[PDB]
CSV table of C-alpha atoms in Angstrom, one decimal:
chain,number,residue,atom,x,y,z
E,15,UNK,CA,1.3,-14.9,20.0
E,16,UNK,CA,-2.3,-13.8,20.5
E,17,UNK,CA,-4.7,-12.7,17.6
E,18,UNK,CA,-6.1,-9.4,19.6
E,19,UNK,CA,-2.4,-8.7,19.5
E,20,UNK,CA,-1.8,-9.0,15.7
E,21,UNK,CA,-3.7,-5.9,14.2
E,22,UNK,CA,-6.7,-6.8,11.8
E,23,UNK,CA,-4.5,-6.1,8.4
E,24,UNK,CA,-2.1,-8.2,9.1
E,25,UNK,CA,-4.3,-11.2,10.0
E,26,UNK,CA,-4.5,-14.5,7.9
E,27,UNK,CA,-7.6,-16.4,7.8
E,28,UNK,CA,-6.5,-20.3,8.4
E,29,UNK,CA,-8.1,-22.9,10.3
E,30,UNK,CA,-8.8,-22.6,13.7
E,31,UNK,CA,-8.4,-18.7,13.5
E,32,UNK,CA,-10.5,-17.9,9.8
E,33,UNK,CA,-12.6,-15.1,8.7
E,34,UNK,CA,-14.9,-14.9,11.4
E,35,UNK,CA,-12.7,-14.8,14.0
E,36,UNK,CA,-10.2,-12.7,11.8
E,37,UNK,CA,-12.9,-10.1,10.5
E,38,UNK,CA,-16.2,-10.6,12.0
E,39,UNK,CA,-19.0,-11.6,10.5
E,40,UNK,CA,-19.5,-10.8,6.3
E,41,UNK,CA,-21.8,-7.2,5.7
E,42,UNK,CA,-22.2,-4.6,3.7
E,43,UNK,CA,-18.6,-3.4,4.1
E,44,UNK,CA,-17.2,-6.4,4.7
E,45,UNK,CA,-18.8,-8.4,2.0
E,46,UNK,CA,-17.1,-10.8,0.2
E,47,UNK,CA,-16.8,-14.6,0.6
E,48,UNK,CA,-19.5,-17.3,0.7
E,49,UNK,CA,-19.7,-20.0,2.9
E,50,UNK,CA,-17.2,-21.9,2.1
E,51,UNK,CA,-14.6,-19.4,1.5
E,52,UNK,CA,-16.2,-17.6,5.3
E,53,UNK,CA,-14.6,-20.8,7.2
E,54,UNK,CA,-11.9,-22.3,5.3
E,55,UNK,CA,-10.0,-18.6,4.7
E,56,UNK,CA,-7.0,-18.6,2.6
E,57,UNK,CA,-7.8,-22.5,2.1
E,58,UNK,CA,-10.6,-22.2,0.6
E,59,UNK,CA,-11.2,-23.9,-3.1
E,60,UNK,CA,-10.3,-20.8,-6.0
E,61,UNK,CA,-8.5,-18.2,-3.4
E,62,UNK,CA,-5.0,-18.4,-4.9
E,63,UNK,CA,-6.7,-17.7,-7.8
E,64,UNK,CA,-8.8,-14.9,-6.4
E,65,UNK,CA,-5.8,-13.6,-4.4
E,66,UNK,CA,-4.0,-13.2,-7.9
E,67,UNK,CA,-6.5,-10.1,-8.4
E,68,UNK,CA,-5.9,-8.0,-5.2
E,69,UNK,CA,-3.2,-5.5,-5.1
E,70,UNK,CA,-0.2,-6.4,-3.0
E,71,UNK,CA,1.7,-3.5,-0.6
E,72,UNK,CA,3.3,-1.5,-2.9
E,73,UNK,CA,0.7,-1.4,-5.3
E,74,UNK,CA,-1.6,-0.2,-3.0
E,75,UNK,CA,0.2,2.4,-1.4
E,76,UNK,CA,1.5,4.2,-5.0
E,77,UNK,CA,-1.0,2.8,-7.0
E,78,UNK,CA,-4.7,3.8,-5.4
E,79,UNK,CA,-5.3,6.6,-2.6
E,80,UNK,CA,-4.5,6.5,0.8
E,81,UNK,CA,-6.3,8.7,2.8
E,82,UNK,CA,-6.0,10.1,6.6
E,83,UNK,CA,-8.6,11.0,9.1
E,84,UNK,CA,-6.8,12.6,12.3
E,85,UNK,CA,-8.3,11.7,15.7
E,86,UNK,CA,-7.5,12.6,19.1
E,87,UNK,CA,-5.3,9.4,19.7
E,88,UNK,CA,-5.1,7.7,16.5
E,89,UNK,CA,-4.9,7.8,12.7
E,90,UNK,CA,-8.1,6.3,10.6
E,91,UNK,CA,-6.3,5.7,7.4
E,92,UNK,CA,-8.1,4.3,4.2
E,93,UNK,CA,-7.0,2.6,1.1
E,94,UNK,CA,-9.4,2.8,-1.8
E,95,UNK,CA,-7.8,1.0,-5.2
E,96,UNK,CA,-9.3,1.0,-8.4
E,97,UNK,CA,-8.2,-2.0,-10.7
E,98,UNK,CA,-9.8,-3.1,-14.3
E,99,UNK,CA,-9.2,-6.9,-15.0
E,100,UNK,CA,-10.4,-7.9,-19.0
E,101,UNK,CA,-13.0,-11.0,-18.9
E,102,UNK,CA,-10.5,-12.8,-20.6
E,103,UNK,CA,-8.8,-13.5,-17.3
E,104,UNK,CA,-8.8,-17.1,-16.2
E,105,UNK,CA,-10.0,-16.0,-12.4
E,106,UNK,CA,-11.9,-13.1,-12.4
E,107,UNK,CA,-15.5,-14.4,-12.2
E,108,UNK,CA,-14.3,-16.7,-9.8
E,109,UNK,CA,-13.5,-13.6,-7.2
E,110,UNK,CA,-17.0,-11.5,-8.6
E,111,UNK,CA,-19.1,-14.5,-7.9
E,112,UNK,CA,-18.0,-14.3,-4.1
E,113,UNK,CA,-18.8,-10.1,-3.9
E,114,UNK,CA,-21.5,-9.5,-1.9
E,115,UNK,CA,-22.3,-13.5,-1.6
E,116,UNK,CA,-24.0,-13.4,2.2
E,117,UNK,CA,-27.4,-14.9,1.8
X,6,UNK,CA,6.4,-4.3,-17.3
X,7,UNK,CA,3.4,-4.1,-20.1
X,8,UNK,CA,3.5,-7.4,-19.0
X,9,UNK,CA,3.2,-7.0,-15.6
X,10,UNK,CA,-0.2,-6.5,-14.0
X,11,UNK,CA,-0.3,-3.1,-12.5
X,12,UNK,CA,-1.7,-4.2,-9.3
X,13,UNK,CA,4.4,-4.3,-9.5
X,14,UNK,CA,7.3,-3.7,-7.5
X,15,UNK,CA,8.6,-0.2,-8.1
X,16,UNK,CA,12.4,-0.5,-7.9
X,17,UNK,CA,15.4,1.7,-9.2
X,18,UNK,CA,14.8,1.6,-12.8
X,19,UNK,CA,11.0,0.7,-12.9
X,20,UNK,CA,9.9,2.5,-10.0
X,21,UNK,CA,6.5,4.7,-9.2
X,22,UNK,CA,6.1,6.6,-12.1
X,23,UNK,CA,6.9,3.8,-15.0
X,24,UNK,CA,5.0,1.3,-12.9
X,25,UNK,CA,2.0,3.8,-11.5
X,26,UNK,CA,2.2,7.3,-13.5
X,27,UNK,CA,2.8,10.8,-11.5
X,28,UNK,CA,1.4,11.3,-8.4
X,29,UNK,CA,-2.3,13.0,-8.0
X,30,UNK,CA,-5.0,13.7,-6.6
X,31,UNK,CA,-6.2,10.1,-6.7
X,32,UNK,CA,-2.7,8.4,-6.3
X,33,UNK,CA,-1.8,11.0,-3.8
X,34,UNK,CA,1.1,8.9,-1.4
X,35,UNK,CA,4.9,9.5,-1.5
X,36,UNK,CA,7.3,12.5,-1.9
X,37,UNK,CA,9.9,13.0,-3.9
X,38,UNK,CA,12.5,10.1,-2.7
X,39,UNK,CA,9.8,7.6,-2.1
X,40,UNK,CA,8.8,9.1,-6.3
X,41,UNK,CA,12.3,8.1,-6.9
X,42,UNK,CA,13.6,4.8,-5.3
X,43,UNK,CA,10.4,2.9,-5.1
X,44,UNK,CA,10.8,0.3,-2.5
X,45,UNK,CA,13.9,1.5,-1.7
X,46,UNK,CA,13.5,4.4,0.1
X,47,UNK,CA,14.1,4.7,3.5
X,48,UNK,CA,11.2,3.8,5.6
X,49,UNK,CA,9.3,1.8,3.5
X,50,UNK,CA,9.1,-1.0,5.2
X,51,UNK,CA,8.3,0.6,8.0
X,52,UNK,CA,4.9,2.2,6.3
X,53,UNK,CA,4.6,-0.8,4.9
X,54,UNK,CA,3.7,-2.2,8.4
X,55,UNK,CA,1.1,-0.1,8.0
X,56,UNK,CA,-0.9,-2.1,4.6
X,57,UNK,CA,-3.6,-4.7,4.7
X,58,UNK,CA,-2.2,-8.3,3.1
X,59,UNK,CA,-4.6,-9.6,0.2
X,60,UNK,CA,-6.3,-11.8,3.0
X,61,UNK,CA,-7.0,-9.0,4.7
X,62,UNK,CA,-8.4,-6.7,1.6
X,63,UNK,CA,-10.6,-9.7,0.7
X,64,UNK,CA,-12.0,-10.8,3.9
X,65,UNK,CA,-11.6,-7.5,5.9
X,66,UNK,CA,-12.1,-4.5,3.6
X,67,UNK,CA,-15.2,-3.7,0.8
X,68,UNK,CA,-14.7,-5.6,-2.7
X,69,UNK,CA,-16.9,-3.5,-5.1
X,70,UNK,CA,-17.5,-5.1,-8.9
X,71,UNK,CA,-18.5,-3.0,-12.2
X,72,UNK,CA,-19.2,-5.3,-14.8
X,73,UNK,CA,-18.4,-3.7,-18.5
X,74,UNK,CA,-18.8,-5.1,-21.8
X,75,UNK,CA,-15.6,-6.6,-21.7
X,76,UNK,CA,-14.0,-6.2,-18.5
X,77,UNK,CA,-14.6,-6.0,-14.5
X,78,UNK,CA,-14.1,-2.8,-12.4
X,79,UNK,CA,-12.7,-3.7,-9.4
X,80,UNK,CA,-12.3,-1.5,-6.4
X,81,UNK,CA,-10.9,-2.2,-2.8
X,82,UNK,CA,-11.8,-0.2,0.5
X,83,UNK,CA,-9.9,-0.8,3.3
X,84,UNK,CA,-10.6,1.0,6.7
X,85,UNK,CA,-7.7,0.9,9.3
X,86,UNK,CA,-7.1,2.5,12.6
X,87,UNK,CA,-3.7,3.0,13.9
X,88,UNK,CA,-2.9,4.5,17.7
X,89,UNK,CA,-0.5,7.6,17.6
X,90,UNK,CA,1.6,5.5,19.7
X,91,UNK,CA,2.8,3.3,16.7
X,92,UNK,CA,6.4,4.8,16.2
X,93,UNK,CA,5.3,5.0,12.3
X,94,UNK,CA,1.9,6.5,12.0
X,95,UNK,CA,3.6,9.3,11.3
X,96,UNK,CA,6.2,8.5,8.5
X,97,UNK,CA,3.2,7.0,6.7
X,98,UNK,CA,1.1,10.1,7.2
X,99,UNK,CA,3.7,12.7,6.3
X,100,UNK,CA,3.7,10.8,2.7
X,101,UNK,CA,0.1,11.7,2.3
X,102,UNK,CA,-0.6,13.9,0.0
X,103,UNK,CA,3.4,15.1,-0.2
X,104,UNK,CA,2.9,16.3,-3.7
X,105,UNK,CA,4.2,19.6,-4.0
């Protein structure tokens, strides 16, 4: 398999493929991950942790908004999901620390 | 399920509304069987197709942070563009919205 031919939400940063070559380079969208976490993906030192405070499928589709923008030959669909963790949680500064990290 | 951290598989007894709440303006996706049967309605796992994995929300969507006295506000934005030619474009969008 190629990775132009798996579509960008289905991707898995990992090695040789990671974040850059999965998503591009980090920016004011796509903002979050240092370094570290930029080239080692899904490998990288807290993201099990991190990954424990993201919503999986279902969640996101019946439990934030999924909105539709109709074009002429596709669908622009986007998920925006609201989620408030307590600071008692074991993991959470360990994903805020890595918002908006690009330096 | 108070157990649970929203963020849940919706299935036969616990489904969307014990695990999410009613559908709204805000949670705004599924009609009335994919209301009822959660993950299994039919389809589902073809709009699931459809969904960023967590990898992808982290690394390819916006993480916005709100910090409070005692918590974090989280929120995820994920952009996505399908082609009309994907046979379930379609059975995802008719869900939008389907409140009625």
């Amino acid at each position: 398999r190629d990775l132009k031919d798996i579509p960008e939400w289905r991707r898995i940063p990992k090695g040789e493929n990671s974040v850059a070559a999965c998503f591009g380079p980090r920016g004011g969208f796509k903002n979050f991950g240092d370094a570290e976490f930029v080239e080692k993906g899904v490998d990288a030192s807290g993201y099990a942790q991190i990954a424990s405070l993201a919503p999986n499928v279902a969640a996101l589709l019946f439990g934030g908004n999924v909105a539709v923008r109709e074009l002429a030959d596709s669908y622009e669909i986007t998920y925006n999901y609201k989620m408030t963790v307590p600071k008692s949680d074991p993991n959470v500064e360990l994903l805020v620390s890595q918002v908006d990290a690009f330096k």
